[PDB]
Structures are given as structure tokens and as C-alpha cells.
């Protein structure tokens, strides 16, 4: 418990979540027109929303230039999709952090579950009915995302995830903290400089 | 550092009743009825000569009064 507290001091979790959201937004900005995107709105969420595991809501809502013809609910990694299922002008995303642990460290499954739930549950104030739940596992450093998809989106998302995990600064901070707690280090050179 | 020296007196502290008729309301609240150490040398000068003048004096020590005097002199003509 103590160790965890040390790791996640200075509202670390929240910071991580927000950081991820920001990154996502930036990515979207970088490629708006290519996916027919008018506006990528950041929700002004309650500080708690990130460490509420009971409820949920959107983080990054999304608006079409014209219209998006989104697919069925599905996993981030999938070659076989069809964009002839449902339609929307408005999409959303949800970054879900969770501290995985050996039994319940499967992230993909978790994402699938929560997406299924928080769509159907009334308390999750999603603007639209079609969105995605990007799920990051802090405690194993594993992402996976589940939900609806429009053409060219999924690859972009994947790319972001790849970059995010490499780069995202709050996650790096978290990693560092973990390392400190453990006193694992990377070699560098043994002799003193 | 100690307090600077008090001035050597080789002059008359010029009074308000020495002025003409109109200039006696230049000092309406005539508290001392005698000008400060600086103006005693500048008063006659102010009155006498219509020339270009310069007062290198301490901060807050009758500059306003001097100005007033000058104005009065100017008006005299």
C-alpha cells in the first residue's frame, strides 16, 4: 500500500490520464481533415472521472465534417472490419486506466467488458452512442482499445498507442517511480565517469 | 554617518512684511514670518535681477516658494 502511495503521489494517476488525453487530442489535430474531422472536443471532466471505476464518461468527443459510417464494436487489433453498419456525426473516446494484476491483467477483455457496460449503462454520460474505449493498463504497461471504427481511424489509433507508450511523459514518470520503488536500473556503465 | 552640519549664519532671515502690498498674500499661512536659510540669499536676487537663474538645493526646502516669488516678480512688470 505504502509503495503504491509513493508511486502515485501528486495525483499521479489523474495526471497520467489527462496527459494521455492531451496526447490523443494533439494526434487528432495533426490529422483532422484526413479522417473527415471538424472538431475534437476535450470534455471538461470532474477530476475524479479517471479514478471512478464504478461509472465512466467520454474524455475526447469528436465531430464530423460530414458523416462517419462506423463499424460494429470491435478490438483495436483487427484486419476484418466493415464500415457499413451504423452512421454518426458525433463520436467519443474514453481513456480507461487500471492497475492490472495477474488474474485481471488481461486488458483487451477488460476494455471489451467496460465498453459493453458503459454504453448500455445510463450513468455514463456519453454524448453519442458510438465511441471507443481506449484502455491503458498502468500496472502492466499494456493498452488495448475497444469500440466503433470508421475508415483510416484504427491504424492511426494504433500508431498513437505505439508512440504514446514510448513517449507519454506521465507514463514515463510512472515507470520511473516504479523503478525507484523496485531499485531495478538500466546498466549504463559500471565504472564511475 | 552623523547628521550633516547646521548652516553658518552670514545673512538676515528675510520676513514677509518687507514685501510690497500685493505680495503679502504669497505666504497666507505665514507660520515663521521669516524665509528658510536658502531663500534669504535668493529673495533679493529673485526681486532684483531679470536674468537666468539656477537653484541647486535640498529635496523639499522651499522650491515652491521660490517659484512663487519668481512668478510674482514676473507679474510685477
Amino acid at each position: 500500500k505504502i509503495s503504491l502511495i509513493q508511486i502515485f503521489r501528486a495525483h499521479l494517476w489523474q495526471k497520467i490520464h489527462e496527459s494521455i488525453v492531451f496526447d490523443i487530442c494533439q494526434i487528432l489535430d495533426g490529422e483532422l481533415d484526413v479522417l473527415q474531422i471538424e472538431s475534437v472536443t476535450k470534455e471538461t471532466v470532474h477530476p475524479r472521472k479517471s479514478y471512478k471505476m464504478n461509472s465512466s464518461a467520454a474524455d475526447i468527443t469528436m465531430e464530423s465534417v460530414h458523416e462517419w459510417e462506423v463499424s460494429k464494436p470491435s478490438l483495436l487489433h483487427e484486419t476484418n472490419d466493415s464500415f457499413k453498419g451504423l452512421i454518426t456525426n458525433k463520436m467519443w473516446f474514453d481513456v480507461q486506466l487500471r492497475y492490472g494484476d495477474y488474474d485481471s491483467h488481461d486488458i483487451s477483455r477488460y476494455v471489451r467488458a467496460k465498453f459493453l457496460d458503459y454504453t448500455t449503462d445510463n450513468v455514463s454520460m456519453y454524448p453519442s452512442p458510438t465511441g471507443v474505449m481506449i484502455g491503458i493498463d498502468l500496472a502492466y504497461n499494456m493498452y488495448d482499445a475497444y469500440g466503433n471504427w470508421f475508415n483510416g481511424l484504427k491504424p492511426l489509433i494504433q500508431n498513437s498507442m505505439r508512440t504514446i507508450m514510448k513517449a507519454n511523459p506521465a507514463l514515463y514518470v510512472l515507470r520511473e517511480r516504479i523503478r525507484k520503488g523496485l531499485q531495478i536500473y538500466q546498466s549504463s556503465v559500471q565504472e564511475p565517469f | 554617518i552623523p547628521a550633516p552640519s547646521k548652516p553658518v549664519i552670514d545673512y538676515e532671515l528675510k520676513e514677509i512684511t518687507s514685501l510690497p502690498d500685493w505680495c503679502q498674500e504669497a505666504f497666507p499661512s505665514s507660520e515663521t514670518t521669516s524665509l528658510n536659510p536658502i531663500q534669504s540669499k535668493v529673495f533679493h536676487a529673485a526681486f532684483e535681477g531679470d536674468s537666468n537663474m539656477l537653484i541647486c538645493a535640498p529635496t523639499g526646502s522651499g522650491k515652491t516658494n521660490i517659484a512663487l516669488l519668481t512668478v510674482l516678480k514676473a507679474l510685477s512688470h
Binding site: 487530442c25 481533415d33 471538424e38 472538431s39 465531430e63 465534417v65 | -
Partner: protein
């Protein structure tokens, strides 16, 4: 990001005079058989300046045939009109009643002009439909000027329209992406346009002096 998108665009809009330093078109064969348009370098520049980097700005264009060649069309009068623009589309008002003003001794409806950011050799659904709406039973042989715009250079892609497009427009106003697909390149015949500095032209604008109704949604 409804707040970020507009501000950025506005900022960009300073660098719109720079898009006419280089000007070039895919030079089509010059043919006297059909009527040919002679556009000036100042009006176009002005239009560019007015316009947005993302959103489609689109005015009407007017003029008349000179006595050197009746086949030649000289664009003297641009007619900027009430409009609400989006990214790759625009909502536009009726044909302008402009008999009241001076210097309008029978100025014929030559057509309309618009901006975009996708290099096509044809008119898209949001455009073609609009065109149809504008000139359904009013004038069949009017032309369009689609100006492709990007940082560095603009490009004047002029187009004409056949009788089949009008019908399509009439039937297929809102949505209609598969019908657009079906239509595709046909029918947008590349009409003849020139850019000159030997003639110049002027702007008509509405009485309110607020042609762009982007954020005036109710008015």
C-alpha cells in the same frame, strides 16, 4: 476543438496574398467553338484574401460579351452574396437582383466562383447540387470556377455542366454520397478560363455588408 479550429484558420488568413505569387493551370487546348472566359488578376486576388484556408467561400460572377469577340466573356462584376460555409461545402442564397445599381446595363449572369482544398478534375456532390439549386430553370449554360488553394500557389479549375447534372441536383440535395459516386467525373466538362492584367473588375456586396453568415446562424 470548436474554438481551436477557427482561431488557427484566422491566423493563417494573413498568408493568403502569398498564394498568388505562383499561379498555374493544366493548360487545356484553346477552342473558339465554345465561349471562353477572361478573368482578371485583381478580383481573384481579392477573393482569395476574403476566403478561408479550410472553409468554402463562394460568390456569384457577372459580366458581358465585348465587341471584339462576342464569344469572349469578360468578367467585370463579381457579386459576393449571403452564405454559410463549412469544410468542403457551403449554403448559398438566390440569384442576386442587381438592376437597381448603376453600371448594370444588361450584365448577364455568367455564373459563380468558389474555393476548396482538394485537386479534382470534376465538381463534387456538395458543389454540383448547389449549382443545380442555383440555376435549375434559370440558365443551363452557366460556368463554375473552382479555385484550388494551398500555401504557395492557387489553381483555377473552371467547369461547365450538362442537362443531366441539374436533374441529379434536383433529386439528390441532402446527404447522397453513393449517388455522387455514381455520377463521379461525368458531367463536369473543363470550360475555358484565362487570367489577365489587361482588364480589371469590381465587387457587389449585400446591404448589411456581412456576406459570411458563419456564426450568424439565425439571420
Amino acid at each position: 476543438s470548436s474554438k481551436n479550429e477557427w482561431r488557427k484558420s484566422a491566423i493563417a488568413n494573413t498568408l493568403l496574398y502569398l498564394r498568388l505569387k505562383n499561379i498555374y493551370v493544366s493548360a487545356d487546348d484553346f477552342v473558339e467553338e465554345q465561349n471562353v472566359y477572361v478573368l482578371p488578376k485583381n478580383l481573384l486576388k481579392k477573393f482569395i484574401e476574403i476566403s478561408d484556408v479550410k472553409i468554402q467561400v463562394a460568390a456569384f460572377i457577372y459580366g458581358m460579351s465585348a465587341k471584339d469577340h462576342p464569344k469572349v466573356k469578360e468578367i467585370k462584376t463579381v457579386v459576393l452574396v449571403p452564405q454559410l460555409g463549412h469544410v468542403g461545402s457551403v449554403q448559398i442564397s438566390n440569384i442576386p437582383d442587381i438592376g437597381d445599381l448603376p453600371d448594370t446595363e444588361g450584365l448577364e449572369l455568367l455564373g459563380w466562383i468558389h474555393t476548396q482544398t482538394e485537386e479534382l478534375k470534376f465538381m463534387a456532390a456538395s458543389e454540383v447540387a448547389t449549382h443545380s439549386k442555383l440555376f435549375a430553370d434559370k440558365k443551363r449554360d452557366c460556368i463554375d470556377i473552382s479555385i484550388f488553394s494551398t500555401p504557395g500557389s492557387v489553381s483555377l479549375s473552371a467547369y461547365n455542366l450538362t442537362d443531366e447534372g441539374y436533374q441529379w441536383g434536383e433529386e439528390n440535395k441532402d446527404i447522397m454520397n453513393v449517388l455522387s459516386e455514381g455520377f463521379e467525373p461525368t458531367f463536369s466538362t473543363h470550360a475555358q478560363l484565362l487570367l489577365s492584367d489587361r482588364i480589371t473588375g469590381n465587387f457587389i456586396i449585400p446591404s448589411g455588408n456581412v456576406w459570411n453568415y458563419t456564426f450568424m446562424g439565425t439571420a
